[PDB]
């Protein structure tokens, strides 16, 4: 099937940047798919961070100008890679990040509504704990 | 920005009962743009039901979902020992998407 | 204060499939040209479409149509069923030079006549790959113990005619007009048409002959780039011409094997016995390989060494370049073209052999026998593509070897139907409108 | 514009060229004969299966024909500005794709009641 | 009631469910089962277009209950309006007007005729 | 039943062309607003550049074959004007019915 | 019986499948029918056939 792996538990100091990678296995092209990045705080609810669709990456209204999402296509000796960089993180960013894909091939599939969509395949999630 | 309210907060049942979880939005979602997810404690989340009343490949037929105006309900009949976890109702009608609040099902 | 209004003729289309018919403008042919109907493009704005060339249904329908058209002209004429006799073949020598002795044989055999209780001792000339010996030495046909040999029909032609698979009313055909399109993904320039352009059903392996060219650069297409079991299609931007010829005369002789049953064999050769050969330009092939490797280095890296070697081994219709010129099937060695190593007035002559028993479409049980062609055969052709593959490495070096391959006829027709899509029109709609009846 | 030329416009800008798409919906036993015969049969059947549904509701020869059923607020709560000027035809059919059967059912009994109510009008 | 569910009722109770029967009169090789499907489709087209051509020459195209200006003769039936719709059914009414069906079918053709444009054209 | 020896490919195709010639004529008559009429009138005016003959000369001396031969160069534009005028009258009726 | 198939080539691309050799013993093919059920159905057959005779 479609299997996705992510990075490990990275501990970072406040003031620097961090970069989380996500490798896919099974997808064909990111033009027929869409990669959404959400998070989940411990003991709280989930939160939608950003997404990349039709080679157009965007974020939410609360993380504008803070995060950066990038993705590349297939390579003959490399899996599909989706990266997300966070710069100038605060002391309230300790969370379990995820990496989701959604197939946007069929127009009448019902899984997507004009850019915003659901999550059909989930990853494992990386724990990021920031402290002084 | 539509705020979702899930009911109940924390409930308990036994092996063989039926669990009904309700979700109430802010506006009136007349297009049935809602989804029900399941996440085990410690494991990865899993999408159960998309578009309110449609199942996914690999989901058993004991789960059922219904939509009526604002109220989206989810019925789980023939409860087993592996369905104890957190359930989420999430809309994707308006940008951006917003999840629910969490509903844990214990055993007693 | 709102009511329902029904609209007829809304531009809404779904994804479906249907049956397409031929359409061409107009000695017979193999493909039915006179059975087709005698033969606009509307640009669309503010609409996108996700195309996928590896999940199309037109390729399988075209393959089934070509298979059904190939087995409709071989039926009503003569079959060569009593030909499986004990041949007596010797060598032929008539001012013949080196490297040709051993490829042609002079055979003699008995054969029935129009009378049931009489025989006739006749003779002919056969090739090396057409006869096998059994233990003067006795010989026999190769496709006798596993297939039945029927003659190719002498009143048809194997010339490719461009046809148009065209959809009926109710459906529509969309076409992506991107110049750098790679067959998979969204296309922001989609236009509707009636049907497609002229597609020539050219049957060839490892060399896309008489195909369609690109617009800007050399295109590389592959399904799974991380797998060593998928073919790689190369589309050039310029054509590379190649001149094939056969210096033999190949006179024909008719033998009557029964009542109304004729058999056309090779008679006597008047002249020299030379090799059939294809000349290809050497100066254009180097810049063609350079423009191929300049686009191929983008998928593997700027620090890669690209080796071009020949085929490893297998069937004769896979490792050798098999094509049809002038009604005769040629099998070229083509080992001198793919021989290079790229680090980060002359002409090449390739000799080709001729076979008379052709097994088409990888079938086991249906053979053929092409008749001899009188005169000198000489043709020209373009090279507008390549079918390559790679082997599995030890994922630690930077050397990649590319070998030519083929055999599957779906890859020869997927390079022409990679931009078209079939949709079904639904013209009904329901709208809210503040209006009442009467 | 041409055939399917207003596919990217709004619902109010594409409701004026409906006659372009309404006229292109009708037009030895070899391999290319049975396919043409099946294509003609499929085109005739696809024309008849739409003409019958147009003739049941009472729109024989009309494209912007009006009905008498009211629009329920549970189907779409949008106004006339966010439909005829923002949404297109490829999204409106997917917006109410779960409510088309009840509309097609309500469009039949109202026409039947209107036809049976006309019989009590000329009997005076 | 369903398809042909009002066959046992009278003419007054079966003339209200015509929309049920008005939607069920219409809906690859050369083997023994490939030609029968094409024959059935051609027969279903033929048995619908022939019935629809008769309503076009009478001026009742697109109407289920259509009535014209043809006067009902007293020699075709000597019953009232209560012994037909409340007592007789559709299977018994067709047997009585079998000898006067072609006369009504010929009188219905000229009606939608004597109602055409005349000189008003000039 | 259905036998296609010599006379099965000629009896089915005749019904096919009959169905097609009926349906094309009904579709061409339905888009002009004359579904079920023969002497129906339209709203487009008659231009003097197509035929400058009077009304007393055409209806009493001319023939339908000569009339088809005479204005054969101005045939498709009348159909286009009718197709525009039917849609314009339908839009005007929808505008009048909305009030 | 335990039959074996043998293919003999009788022409170009034409085979003929015949029997081979019996492995083991050669016995008779047979069918078993329950007797009490057959008698209790034949009794009902006679009881239903006596209405016309
Ligand atoms: C078939 O043919 C098809 C042809 O059409 C073909 O499609 C092509 O596929 C290729 C894939 O190989 C595509 O190439 C890629 O394109 C990506 C597109 O990126 C878009 O988005 C970014 C981001 O935009 C945000 O930021 C800018 C700047 O701030 C703003 O201005 C924007 O508004 C936007 O901001 C919004 O979002 C924010 C949140 O992020 C919000 O906060 C904010 O408020 C806003 O809402 C843009 O910058 C891009 O613009 C660039 O491209 C356009 C193209 O026209 C130019 O005009 C423009 O000038 C820019 O150059 C674009 O819009 C690229 O991201 C991607 O780049 C990667 O690869 C290149 C090398 O090729 C690197 O140089 C680059 O750095 C990226 O690599 C990073 O990521 C990989 C993956 O993990 C890493 O491995 C790598 O190491 C590197 O990571 C490093 O850098 C990171 C920072 O970048 C850092 O965090 C890391 O830690 C690490 O250090 C690449 O170019 C190509 O576009 C397609 N062609 C199209 C669509 O036409 C298809 O594949 C073919 N198929 C097959 C099978 O062959
Ligand atoms: C294109 O061609 C390929 C090659 O045949 C097809 O098959 C895919 O091959 C890739 C190879 O990587 C499969 O990717 C999966 O990656 C997982 C992550 O690997 C990391 O983690 C493991 C430890 O879990 C490390 O050992 C490894 O070094 C990496 O660091 C692997 O875990 C997968 O292996 C097994 O995973 C689970 C068990 O955890 C099983 O369920 C799996 O079946 C598998 O046995 C695997 O290597 C990818 O999954 C393959 N695809 C499929 C469908 O199986 C591609 O499919 C083909 N593309 C298309 C579109 O067909
Ligand atoms: C493909 O290229 C080869 C060579 O690369 C061509 O072979 C050449 O053909 C010419 C003409 O047939 C030969 O010239 C002959 O020379 C003899 C002796 O001088 C003379 O008596 C003849 O009258 C003729 O002029 C030439 O020798 C020969 N070269 C070789 C190396 O064999 C071949 O013709 C090319 N084929 C095509 C289709 O272009
Ligand atoms: C690719 O297309 C070219 C262009 O049509 C093909 O070349 C043509 O091949 C045919 C078949 O041999 C030639 O027809 C023959 O010509 C000779 C000339 O003397 C004539 O005697 C024969 O009776 C027959 O008509 C045709 O002339 C030739 N065209 C040109 C311009 O040379 C080529 O065969 C195609 N490639 C493949 C693989 O089919
Ligand atoms: C609204 O309609 C869509 C499709 O028209 C329904 O989606 C399907 O639901 C069935 C019900 O089990 C599934 O089997 C399918 O897989 C779904 N998808 C498709 C593409 O058919 C959806 O359930 C409907 N919503 C309702 C009835 O509330
Ligand atoms: C193939 O062999 C046959 C004999 O088996 C050759 O026919 C003879 O050719 C010589 C040479 O001219 C004649 O003198 C004889 O009269 C021929 N015999 C018959 C029975 O015709 C034939 O020439 C050989 N073919 C070639 C190309 O050498
Ligand atoms: C054709 O038939 C003739 C007989 O009409 C064959 O000649 C015989 O061949 C056998 C085999 O060696 C000899 O034993 C006989 O002596 C030959 N003569 C006769 C009269 O029987 C001949 O071999 C057959 N084949 C060919 C190629 O000619
Ligand atoms: C293939 O054949 C064509 C013609 O059949 C060759 O084109 C001619 O080549 C000669 C020699 O260079 C020129 O003088 C002519 O002007 C060319 N054109 C024509 C129309 O005759 C072509 O060179 C051949 N290619 C190879 C590789 O031999
Ligand atoms: C196709 O060409 C290659 C390369 O020329 C041939 O490989 C060698 O050719 C030389 C001829 O000078 C022989 O001496 C070698 O023995 C060949 N190497 C082998 C057979 O491994 C190749 O033989 C050619 N193909 C055919 C069928 O002749
Ligand atoms: C081989 O390539 C040449 C060069 O493009 C082709 O010659 C052109 O053919 C097109 C039609 O296919 C003409 O419109 C051009 O005028 C031709 N000349 C040039 C300079 O472009 C040639 O047709 C190709 N061979 C085949 C068989 O298609
Ligand atoms: C005939 O040709 C074969 C194949 O080249 C060769 O082995 C044999 O020696 C030749 N015989 C004679 C007599 O020349
Ligand atoms: C037919 O003969 C050829 C040549 O000896 C041999 O390679 C092949 O295996 C044979 N096939 C069968 C089915 O005996
Ligand atoms: C082939 O032979 C014929 C005679 O049968 C001759 O007229 C013709 O010129 C020959 N062709 C050549 C030599 O190319
Ligand atoms: C590889 O080299 C080409 C040469 O033009 C350059 O454009 C390209 O950016 C290089 N690739 C990388 C990853 O730098
Ligand atoms: C490929 O080339 C090698 C080296 O010349 C040669 O030994 C081999 O026979 C060739 N293979 C084919 C199929 O020609
Ligand atoms: C292949 O290339 C090498 C390197 O130039 C050369 O030595 C060899 O002769 C070539 N082989 C052929 C068959 O051209
Ligand atoms: C496409 O959109 C642009 C602006 O969004 C508009 O000006 C244009 O008219 C649209 N095209 C069509 C065919 O309606
Ligand atoms: C609107 O929908 C409601 C709820 O299904 C239903 O009770 C009511 O009858 C509907 N009204 C109309 C006018 O269709
Ligand atoms: C059949 O007759 C009974 C009278 O006994 C009546 O009540 C019933 O409605 C009839 N059935 C139908 C379908 O009219
Ligand atoms: C009549 O013909 C003239 C000249 O072609 C043209 O300018 C005018 O628009 C036409 N008017 C009508 C009513 O067709
Ligand atoms: C035929 O009609 C013309 C008028 O168009 C008339 O002059 C002529 O006399 C008629 N022919 C006969 C034989 O009456
Ligand atoms: C019957 O024949 C089969 C071979 O198909 C063999 O496996 C099996 O053991 C035989 N049984 C007996 C009882 O000989
Ligand atoms: C037939 O075999 C079945 C087992 O499949 C058994 O139950 C039954 O009793 C047998 N009947 C007879 C008559 O032996
Ligand atoms: C069949 O059953 C009847 C009684 O039901 C009994 O008299 C008779 O003997 C039975 N037949 C046999 C063969 O036992």
Residue numbers in the entry:
A (entry chain M): 1 to 35, 35A, 36 to 51, 53 to 71, 71A, 72, 72A, 72B, ...
B (entry chain O): 1 to 27, 27A, 28 to 107
C (entry chain P): 33 to 58, 65 to 77, 82 to 143, 152 to 185, 188 to 309, 312 to 321, 321A, 322 to 397, ...
D (entry chain C): 520 to 546, 567 to 663
E (entry chain D): 520 to 546, 566 to 660
F (entry chain F): 565 to 663
G (entry chain G): 300 to 309, 312 to 321, 321A, 322 to 353
What did the authors write?
To form complexes, we incubated a threefold molar excess of Ab1245 Fab with BG505, followed by an incubation with a threefold excess of 8ANC19528 Fab to add mass to the complex and prevent problems associated with preferred orientation bias. This resulted in complex formation with three 8ANC195 Fabs and one Ab1245 Fab bound per BG505 trimer, consistent with the stoichiometry experiments. The complex with one Ab1245 Fab per BG505 trimer was resolved at 3.7 Å resolution and showed generally well-defined side-chain density throughout the complex. The Ab1245 Fab was located at the interface between the gp120 and gp41 of its primary Env protomer and the gp41 of a neighboring protomer. By contrast, 8ANC195 recognized the gp120-gp41 interface of a single protomer with no contacts to neighboring protomers, and equivalent interactions with the three BG505 protomers. The Ab1245 heavy chain made the majority of contacts with BG505 (only three light chain residues contact BG505), and all but one of the 19 heavy and light chain contact residues were located within CDRs rather than antibody framework regions (FWRs). Unlike binding of the FP-specific bNAb VRC346 or any other reported HIV-1 antibody, Ab1245 binding to BG505 Env trimer resulted in the displacement of the FP (residues 512gp41–527gp41) and FPPR (residues 528gp41–540gp41) of the gp41 subunit within the primary protomer to which Ab1245 was bound. In the Ab1245-BG505 complex structure, there was no observed density for residues spanning 512gp41–565gp41 on the primary gp41 to which Ab1245 was bound, thus both regions of gp41 were disordered. The stability of the Ab1245-bound BG505 trimer in the closed conformation despite the displacement of Met530gp41 from the tryptophan clasp is rationalized by the insertion of an Ab1245 CDRH3 residue, Met100c1245 HC, into the gp41 tryptophan clasp to mimic Env residue Met530gp41. However, we found no dissociation of Env trimers into protomers in the cryo-EM structure of the Ab1245-BG505-8ANC195 complex that was derived after an overnight incubation of BG505 with Fabs or indication of dissociated protomers by SEC-MALS.
